[PDB]
């Protein structure tokens, strides 16, 4: 009844490869396409809701997750691994930051903490790496808007725009042509919707697409009034209706 | 101790248990806690045995001297003399005394003098460690103008219960009946009062 | 155990000018966190142009004042209606307080009036009768808040003449009765802000050669 | 025995117009014995100023602790900690020693470098924040400082006026306290210059 | 030095335009035991003064006798004992205050808090407090014990300062007093429902009301309160 | 401190005074004793100031994480359960006395909690040194079927009784209203009945009044280039 | 506090006063001291409010977990879980708890758990500070196999007297009736019970 | 470290020619309150041992469960559990003595005094005492609490030394025990009239008598005793 696996399951092979990390990245390649695009006044992150049965209520499976009121994440790869990472990322944002400084962490630092957790799964005893790549979009007062990719190794990189999963090579190329440093958020949403149609086989509507933004403060989503300096979450999940409205001018 | 005095139609009755304790040891199981300070003025004693004796002996002396000079003292007067002693020596005494007496004018009267040396005129009174357990019982079952046989039963049932629940009370139940007829001493043994 | 002392709060303040003196006190009376009264006077005309307050435990304060008033009455009877000078009052009050050296009056006492040259006088006592003449004193609960302000604004402590590097002190002046009442009113407003036992009202007794005058001002009631 | 009055000392901070001031005395003693005449109680981490009164070993220890924490903050965040954030960090750090506390009265002062807003805060020994618009006081002459500040202070003072006001508050409070004084320092803080002045005061 | 044994709780009082009202419940507690249920703690002296007493009841009964003897003694060689040389509230108060402070100064206090309510010769309302320490004070409202914490806030909403006294009628003042007594019955664990109330008016004299009860009590909302948190049934 | 909670028709209202004390000295004249646990769960705090701030921040943090984990809006009974278990574990040494209130999918709620971990339910509640002054007002004026406007009035009146009659309480009245179906409205300094009167005099000194021994420029910047 | 639980022909009834004290101050005058630990297992709480809550919450948790795994727990089982907590933590707790429940097999049962964490199965039980004043009354007036209306009256009269004499008891009298029919909550206001 | 709350008073016992007798009253006191009136403090273990327990009742109930579990555990993998490998009085005693001393050594005693009475396999009488300190001793008579002061002197008049045991019958021993219980009811303020008695005989086995009462009490002389000294009537 004891955990006797106190040795690494990820090790270097003669060629210098860390096989389990490579194999984790292969699981990420098999995963559904997700992407993120940074605009001047916002960030958009998006993915396909590949439903497993049509009897499934795909509304109940949230691929795009709030981590803090100004930070959001989406993934490609193994969904269960993502779900527990989201739980831990939310928690570490409180324990390692908000409970110390009284404010939510900046994006790069929360990314840094998630990266750490993923690196530990790559070296600690008796575990495999996480089989996901994350795209984390966020805003903070001194850095502005940002977009980060996090891989199974624990490595993270900041992006102007990118994509991960199945059709990422094609989607990255599509984004190289359309991205410029003067994009307004609506233009980034429009590009995100165009890029994502290439990677989707079947139905393409607000019920099969999950899309969220980091944009302006939403005081109507806060839940209370009376504190001037609390202006609301910058994270907003677009509704089915809001997505469909933007698909008619497409 | 469990002590009570109850006024009724023809006068007043005093009742007491007979237990004296020395910690958990029963020093005397047939104690007489009802003591005469005048022909028809009696008191029930609770608290320190030494203190209440010393007080009662002084009161008996004061009232015998009152009698020689001014005639028969009232029950209120007897209570006033107990109070003076208990109040002025409150730092040094542990005495809870009930004073009961019969005049022809005032009929039966009951005064209770608790620890601090305040006086309280009442239709009936209860005191001693065992009295806590019968406040409910006595309040529910007391009426004014009871008969002698009713009052004897009220006290017998009340002290029965005090004795049942209080380890510092026990033995026999003694009573003193005070009417125009005179002074009647009653006793009730455990085999009568326990089975009630 | 019985504790024969209590603390009734309040604060008092004496300031002397050239030809006047003031003795001020708040009118609040408290025990623990309750207000007993919003107007219970604490500063008293004692006769012979002497005002007195004994702040702290109000029962001891009232007993002391009562005894000093009586002292003045008997001074008249025994010395042919002679006026009790402020220096003589002070010494008499020392003997009243030191009489209870081993069961003290729990108060801080201030008296004010005019000395025998017509100059303003403030005398100030500890609970067992040590005393000093001063230009300036606060006593009671908010004494620690008020005294340093008085050191600064009455005796010009730590103030230098501008541009003298730091080698010529601000010179001492007597203050007018109007300037003194301003410092008193500000002293008490400041103390009311920060001390829970100070508030409700301010009563000032002013002593000149013409007698004893009173002024009253509202203070915050929270 | 009472750790908050073994060593002595005071700190006061005030806001003016587009400026803050923070001042302290220089004494360190062991009860009646004055030992040092140079024991400063004000430290800075970038542009955020921290005054600490109370037990001197804890004053030193907390300075070293906040130097440590703000150095790491700066490395990870790539910017200097602001006063509002540092205030929260002081509070967190004091409260984590809730049942074995540092015997101190910290005071934060500084200007938010983004918003330009003057900022002061005070704390009790277990981290309760007192964020005041006017002034903050701490130490063995805190009663005396409260009295001086409450009467002398007025809002929107200019740096060179605020200097006179805070210095007179400190000097006169210190003179009514046996364990405070022996010198004083006053920092006047504007958005991008900080003047530090040692006051001439009575040496008893 | 002693400790109080049988005790009385709050005495509450206020001034109104023409007089003073004072009230106290009829209980003598013995620690947590509500021992004696017919104790009068308002004691009239002449037809112009009521002394309301809280704290130790044995010491109250001593004070009662001091006052009774004071009336007897004031009548001696005094043909104006029922007129210009009758006892005043201020005379009765100063006597009690003198005694209380003497007794505290010998470390043997009378363990009481006392309110002397009345009307002087000239029609002035008198209301002053004294306790076991000899501390004395006056105010438009006065209350002892729990009364200080709960009655005074209510009574001060009616008479908050000296200038409010002529604006306050006997109907308004009595209603405030009667309401305060209900609040004390709700909230003081050593209080009772039964109480006495006395009004000393400059025109109508002394009215002394016995066997009052707290009435019009809100308990009905109790049936809706269930558990301490999560318990629904 | 005086803190109160009052239930009304479609919600609950809580109020507090704004004084904090250190011995007999007023440390802060305008503290915020109304602590947000979640957007629609607020509590009024009395007792040891640091403990009340720490306990509400911790439980608020854990309530936020629970809300995210469950995809549900937080309930008042969860805030209450976490507070009671935490406070009970510390055996009264964490001296927080809280009136806990809010709205959630279950309805509107009003609780009190003591430092030792006991909780109560009520339609009206008060805590702190001024709780007796406040409870006297609540016991005299409360009725069932109160409107929002009547409840704000009653709650602020109850705080005022504390402000005027309790030396532990003073300055201003803060309110928070939590109504079913609506955002919670936090009314910072709803009443301001204790503004300090104009001072008689300005104490602004002549420049040069204070004697200086030394000056210097303090280096606040980073290490410079070139 | 004054609390009692009384078995009768059709089941068991629990009764309690509604007063919570903070010294002499009444913190809550409409307290609910009768708490559900299972559908037909309830307890009366006396002693520390915090301690008895913490215990009752743990017991409720233990019995909900018992239910999931093993079906409906007996009243004896519920009392055993209270006892374990009270006994093992006797140094740190001030809890006097009465446990009452209804099974179809065992009918109504009452267990009392005083300070030390002993258990005592009884036909009826009384506890709390106010119970001292009604030992006499309750012993004299309790019979087995009373009707529901008789038992409601017995409890109403008993707690009436406890409330009358104990300053730490008061407010409303709450009762919980436990039979095969279900669970009935009763309330009785001062204006009914005082004049008895 | 604790303090005992609900308590049981004396347990008394003696040896006679063929066995042992032990008795204890049925009371659980709560200080001076005689709280619980049907408490069994004699606890049989098998058909050869009775453990009599005084002191804290919550700790008694714990010991009761330890003994019940000891019987269960001795039956495990033991085909001779009802014969040669049945629990003996000496085994039960040593177990309890071990526990008592361990508990006192951790400063957390079981607040009890215990007498283990029984008959061994070979017919030997067993009678031994242990308490909260782990102190143990044996004697022809043993008693706890008040029993040590009043019962032992009476029981020792019957069995004063080892050589008196064969001379003492079960009738004589039971009569001495029953008399001792009456004396304790007369004189111990925390005793009761109702008691239980158990005999463990080498021939007739375990006899356990419940609901015994103290009877044939002399109270009659009480009517002649008047006052405390000089009072004649
Ligand atoms: C309930 C009971 C039995 O205690 C009742 O109150 C008794 C009244 C009584 C007894 C005999 C004659 C008349 C009246 N009281 C006693 O039995 C007292 C109990 C008691 C002892 C001590 C104190 O001290 C404040 C109060 C009550 N028993 C005695 O007084 C016995 C004879 N003496 C002692 O126990 C010796 N005491 C011990 C305590 O220190 C003083 C000396
Ligand atoms: C009316 C009052 C002032 O008591 C009310 O309860 C305040 C509530 C409050 C809540 C949130 C923020 C600010 C204020 N409480 C205070 O102001 C407390 C009062 C208090 C002092 C001391 C103790 O001691 C057991 C309890 C309550 N004030 C403080 O907590 C102040 C800021 N800090 C200290 O006094 C130092 N502490 C005291 C407790 O022990 C640790 C050091
Ligand atoms: C008779 C009475 C009213 O006391 C009865 O036993 C109550 C039972 C009850 C109350 C509310 C809900 C459920 C059950 N008990 C109380 O009202 C208790 C009395 C009590 C307090 C403390 C101790 O400590 C050993 C025992 C009994 N009241 C409280 O617990 C109140 C809410 N809290 C306090 O008074 C704070 N205490 C003070 C003592 O130190 C611990 C913290
Ligand atoms: Mg004030
Ligand atoms: Mg100095
Ligand atoms: Mg010096
Ligand atoms: Mg009651």
What string, H for helix and E for strand, traces the elements of chain F in order?
Answer: EEEEEEHHEEEEHHEEE
For CATH, the homologous superfamily of chain F is named as Aminohydrolase, N-terminal nucleophile (Ntn) domain
The amount of helix of chain A comes to: 25-40%
* Assembly annotation: part of a larger assembly
Name of the CATH architecture of chain F: 4-Layer Sandwich
Categorize the overall geometry of chain A.
globular
Number of strands of chain F: 13
CATH C-level category of chain A = Alpha Beta
Q: How are strands sequenced across the largest beta sheet of chain F?
A: 10-1-2-11-12
Taken from the alpha-carbon principal axes, the silhouette of chain F is globular
Overall description:
Chain C: One of its GO terms (cellular component) is proteasome core complex, beta-subunit complex. Chain C: One of its GO terms (biological process) is proteasomal ubiquitin-independent protein catabolic process. Chain C: It is found in: Cytoplasm; Nucleus. Chain C: It comes from Saccharomyces cerevisiae (strain ATCC 204508 / S288c). Chain C: InterPro entries: Ntn_hydrolases_N, Proteasome_bsu_CS, Proteasome_sua/b, Proteasome_suB-type. Chain F: It comes from Saccharomyces cerevisiae (strain ATCC 204508 / S288c). The structure is cut from a larger assembly and holds one copy of chain A (250 residues), two copies of chain B (196 residues), one copy of chain C (222 residues), one copy of chain D (204 residues), two copies of chain E (233 residues) and one copy of chain F (226 residues). Chain A is built from six helices and eleven strands. With 250 residues, chain A is of the alpha+beta class. In chain A, β6 (144-150) and β7 form a beta hairpin. Chain A is globular. Chain C has 222 residues and is of the alpha+beta class. Chain C contains four helices and twelve strands. In chain C, the strands form three sheets. In chain C, strands 10-1-2-11-12 form a five-stranded antiparallel beta sheet. In chain C, a hairpin with a 2-residue loop joins β11 and β12. In chain C, α1 (58-78) crosses α2 (86-98). Chain C is globular, with a radius of gyration of 18 Å. With 233 residues, chain E is an alpha+beta fold. Chain E contains four helices and 13 strands. Chain E has helices spanning 57-75, 89-105, 146-158, 170-187, and strands at residues 6-8, 11-16, 19-25, 28-30, 33-36, 42-44, 49-56, 112-119, 125-131, 136-138, 141-143, 194-201, 205-213. In chain E, strands 1, 4, 5, 6, 7, 8, 9 and 10 form an eight-stranded antiparallel beta sheet that branches. Chain E is globular. Chain F has 226 residues and is of the alpha+beta class. Chain F has a single domain (1-226), classed as Glutamine Phosphoribosylpyrophosphate, subunit 1, domain 1 (4-Layer Sandwich), CATH 3.60.20. Chain F has helices at 49-70, 76-89, 131-141, 148-165, and strands at residues 3-8, 11-17, 20-22, 25-28, 34-38, 41-47, 96-104, 107-113, 119-121, 124-127, 173-179, 184-191, 212-217. In chain F, the strands form three sheets. Chain F has a five-stranded antiparallel beta sheet, with helices on one face. Chain F has a five-stranded antiparallel beta sheet with strand order 5-6-7-8-9, covered by helices on one side. Chain F has a two-stranded antiparallel sheet with strand order 3-4. Classes of the chains: A alpha+beta (250), B alpha+beta (196), C alpha+beta (222), D alpha+beta (204), E alpha+beta (233), F alpha+beta (226). The D-F interface holds D 44, 46-47, 91, 94-95, 98-99, 122, 124, 126-130, 132, 142-143, 146, 151-152, 154, 157, 160-161, 163-165, 167-168, 171, 187, 192-201 and F 20, 22, 25, 27-28, 31, 48-51, 53-54, 93-94, 199, 202-207, 209-218, 220, 222. The structure holds the ligand *C[C@@](C)(O)[C@](*)(O)[C@H](Cc1ccccc1)NC(=O)[C@H](Cc1ccc(OC)cc1)NC(=O)[C@H](C)NC(=O)CN1CCOCC1 (3 copies) and magnesium ion (MG) (4 copies). One copy of the ligand *C[C@@](C)(O)[C@](*)(O)[C@H](Cc1ccccc1)NC(=O)[C@H](Cc1ccc(OC)cc1)NC(=O)[C@H](C)NC(=O)CN1CCOCC1 sits between chains F (1, 19-22, 27, 31, 33, 45-49, 52, 95, 128-129, 168-169) and D (124-126, 128).
């Amino acid at each position: 009844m004891t955990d006797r696996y106190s040795f690494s399951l990820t090790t270097f092979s003669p060629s210098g490869k860390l096989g389990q990390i490579d194999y984790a990245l292969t699981a990420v390649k098999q995963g559904v396409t997700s992407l993120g695009i940074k605009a001047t006044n916002g960030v958009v992150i998006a993915t396909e809701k590949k439903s497993s049965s049509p009897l499934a209520m795909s509304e109940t499976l949230s691929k795009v997750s709030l981590l803090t009121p100004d930070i959001g994440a989406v993934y490609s790869g193994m969904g269960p691994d993502y779900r527990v990472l989201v739980d831990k990322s939310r928690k570490v944002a409180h324990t390692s930051y908000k409970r110390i400084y009284g404010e939510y962490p900046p994006t790069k630092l929360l990314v840094s903490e998630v990266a750490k957790i993923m690196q530990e799964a790559t070296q600690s005893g008796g575990v495999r790496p996480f089989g996901v790549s994350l795209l984390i979009a966020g805003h903070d007062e001194f850095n502005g808007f940002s977009l980060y990719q996090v891989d199974p190794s624990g490595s993270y990189f900041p992006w102007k725009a990118t994509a991960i999963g199945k059709g990422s090579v094609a989607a990255k190329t599509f984004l190289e042509k359309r991205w410029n440093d003067e994009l307004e958020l609506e233009d980034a949403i429009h590009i995100a919707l165009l890029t994502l149609k290439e990677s989707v086989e079947g139905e393409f509507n607000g019920d099969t697409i999950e899309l969220a933004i980091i944009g302006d403060e939403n005081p109507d989503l806060l839940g209370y009034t009376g504190i001037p300096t609390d202006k609301g979450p910058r994270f907003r999940k677009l509704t089915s209706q809001e997505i469909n409205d933007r698909l008619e001018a497409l | 101790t469990s002590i009570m005095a109850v006024t009724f139609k023809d006068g007043v009755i005093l009742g007491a248990d007979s237990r004296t304790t020395t910690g958990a040891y029963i020093a005397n199981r047939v104690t007489d806690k009802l003591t005469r300070v005048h022909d028809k003025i009696w008191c029930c004693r609770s608290g320190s045995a030494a203190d209440t004796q010393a007080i009662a002996d002084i009161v008996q002396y004061h009232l015998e001297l009152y009698t020689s000079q001014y005639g028969t003292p009232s029950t209120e007067t007897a209570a006033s003399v107990f109070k003076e002693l208990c109040y002025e020596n409150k730092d040094n005494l542990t005495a809870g005394i009930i004073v009961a007496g019969y005049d022809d004018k005032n009929k039966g009267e009951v005064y209770t003098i608790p620890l601090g040396g305040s006086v309280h005129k009442l239709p009936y009174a209860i005191a001693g460690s065992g009295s806590t357990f019968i406040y409910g019982y006595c309040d529910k079952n007391f009426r004014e103008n009871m008969s002698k046989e009713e009052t004897v039963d009220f006290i017998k049932h009340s002290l029965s219960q005090a004795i049942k629940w209080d380890g510092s009370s026990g033995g026999v139940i003694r009573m003193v009946v005070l009417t125009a007829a005179g002074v009647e001493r009653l006793i009730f043994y455990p085999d009568e009062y326990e089975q009630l | 155990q019985f504790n024969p002392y209590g603390d009734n709060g309040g604060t008092i303040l004496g300031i002397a000018g050239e030809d006047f003196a003031v003795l001020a006190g708040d009118t609040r009376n408290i025990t623990d966190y309750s207000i007993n009264s919003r107007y219970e006077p604490k500063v008293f005309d004692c006769g012979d142009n002497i005002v007195m307050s004994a702040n702290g435990f109000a029962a001891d304060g009232d007993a002391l004042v009562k005894r000093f008033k009586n002292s003045v009455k008997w001074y008249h009877f025994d010395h042919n209606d002679k006026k009790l000078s402020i220096n003589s009052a002070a010494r008499n009050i020392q003997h009243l307080l030191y009489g209870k050296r081993f069961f003290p009056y729990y108060v801080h006492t201030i008296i004010a009036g005019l000395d025998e040259d017509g100059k303003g006088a403030v005398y100030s006592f500890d609970p067992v009768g040590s005393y000093e003449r001063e230009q300036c004193r606060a006593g009671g609960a908010a004494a620690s808040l008020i005294m340093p302000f008085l050191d600064n604004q009455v005796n010009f402590k730590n103030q230098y003449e501008p541009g003298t590097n730091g080698k010529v002190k601000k010179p001492l002046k007597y203050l007018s009765v109007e300037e003194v009442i301003k410092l008193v009113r500000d002293s008490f407003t400041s103390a009311t802000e920060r001390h829970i036992q100070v508030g409700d009202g301010l009563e000032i007794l002013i002593v000149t050669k013409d007698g004893v005058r009173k002024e009253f001002y509202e203070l915050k009631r929270d | 025995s009472d750790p908050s009055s073994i060593n002595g000392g005071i700190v006061v901070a005030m806001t003016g117009k587009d400026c803050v001031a923070i001042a302290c005395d220089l004494r360190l003693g062991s009860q009646s014995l004055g030992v040092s005449n140079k024991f400063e109680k004000i430290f800075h981490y970038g542009h955020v100023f921290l005054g600490i009164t109370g037990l001197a070993t804890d004053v030193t220890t907390l300075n070293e602790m906040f130097r440590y924490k703000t150095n790491l903050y700066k490395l990870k965040e790539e910017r200097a900690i602001e006063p509002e954030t540092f205030t929260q960090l002081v509070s967190s750090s004091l409260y984590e020693r809730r049942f074995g506390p540092y015997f101190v009265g910290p005071v934060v002062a500084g200007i938010n470098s983004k918003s330009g807003k003057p900022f002061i805060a005070g704390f009790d020994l277990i981290g309760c924040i007192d964020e005041a618009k006017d002034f903050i006081v701490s130490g063995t002459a805190s009663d005396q400082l409260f009295g001086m500040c409450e009467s002398l202070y007025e809002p929107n003072l200019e740096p060179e006026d605020l200097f006179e006001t805070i210095s007179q508050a400190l000097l006169n409070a210190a003179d009514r306290d046996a364990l405070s004084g022996w010198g004083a320092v006053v920092y006047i803080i504007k958005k991008d210059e900080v003047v530090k002045r040692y006051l001439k005061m009575r040496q008893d | 030095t002693q400790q109080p044994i049988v005790t009385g709780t709050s005495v509450i009082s206020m001034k109104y335009d023409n007089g003073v009202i004072i009230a106290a419940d009829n209980l003598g507690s013995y620690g947590s035991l509500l021992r004696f249920n017919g104790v009068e703690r308002l004691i009239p002296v002449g037809d112009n003064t009521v002394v309301g007493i809280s704290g130790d009841i044995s010491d109250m009964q001593h004070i009662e006798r001091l006052l009774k003897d004071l009336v007897t003694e004031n009548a001696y060689d005094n043909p104006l004992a029922d007129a210009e040389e009758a006892l005043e509230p201020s005379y009765i108060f100063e006597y009690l205050a003198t005694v209380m402070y003497q007794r505290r100064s010998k470390m043997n206090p009378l363990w009481n808090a006392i309110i002397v309510a009345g009307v002087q010769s000239n029609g002035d309302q008198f209301l002053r407090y004294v306790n076991l320490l000899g501390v004395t004070y006056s105010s438009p409202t006065l209350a002892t014990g729990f009364g200080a914490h709960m009655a005074n806030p209510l009574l001060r909403k009616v008479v908050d300062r000296e200038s409010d006294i002529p604006k306050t009628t006997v109907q308004v003042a009595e209603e405030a007093i009667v309401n305060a007594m209900r609040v004390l019955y709700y909230r003081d664990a050593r209080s009772s429902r039964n109480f006495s109330l006395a009004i000393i008016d400059k025109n109508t004299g002394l009215t002394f009301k016995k066997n009052l009860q707290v009435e019009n009590m809100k308990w009905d909302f109790a049936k809706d309160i269930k558990g301490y948190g999560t318990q629904k049934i | 401190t005086t803190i109160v909670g009052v239930k009304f028709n479609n919600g609950v209202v809580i109020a507090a005074d704004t004084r904090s004390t250190q011995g007999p000295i007023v440390a802060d004249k305008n503290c915020a004793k109304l602590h947000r646990i979640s957007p629609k769960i607020w509590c009024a705090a009395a007792g040891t100031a640091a403990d009340t701030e720490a306990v509400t921040q911790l439980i608020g943090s854990n309530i936020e994480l629970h809300s995210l984990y469950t995809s549900r809006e937080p309930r008042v009974v969860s805030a209450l359960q976490m507070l009671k278990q935490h406070l009970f574990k510390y055996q009264g040494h964490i001296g927080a006395y809280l009136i806990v209130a809010g709205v959630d999918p279950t309805g509107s709620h009003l609780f009190s909690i003591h430092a030792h971990g006991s909780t109560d339910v009520g339609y009206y509640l008060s805590l702190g040194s001024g709780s007796l002054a406040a409870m006297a007002v609540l016991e005299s004026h409360w009725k069932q079927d109160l409107t929002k406007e009547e409840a704000i009035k009653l709650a602020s009146d109850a705080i005022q009784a504390g402000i005027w009659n309790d030396l532990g309480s003073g300055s201003n009245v803060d309110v928070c209203v939590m109504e079913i179906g609506k955002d919670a409205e936090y009314l910072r300094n709803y009443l301001t009945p204790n503004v300090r009167e104009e001072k008689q005099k300005s104490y602004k000194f002549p420049r040069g009044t204070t004697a200086v021994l030394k000056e210097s420029i303090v280096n606040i910047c980073d290490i410079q280039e070139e």
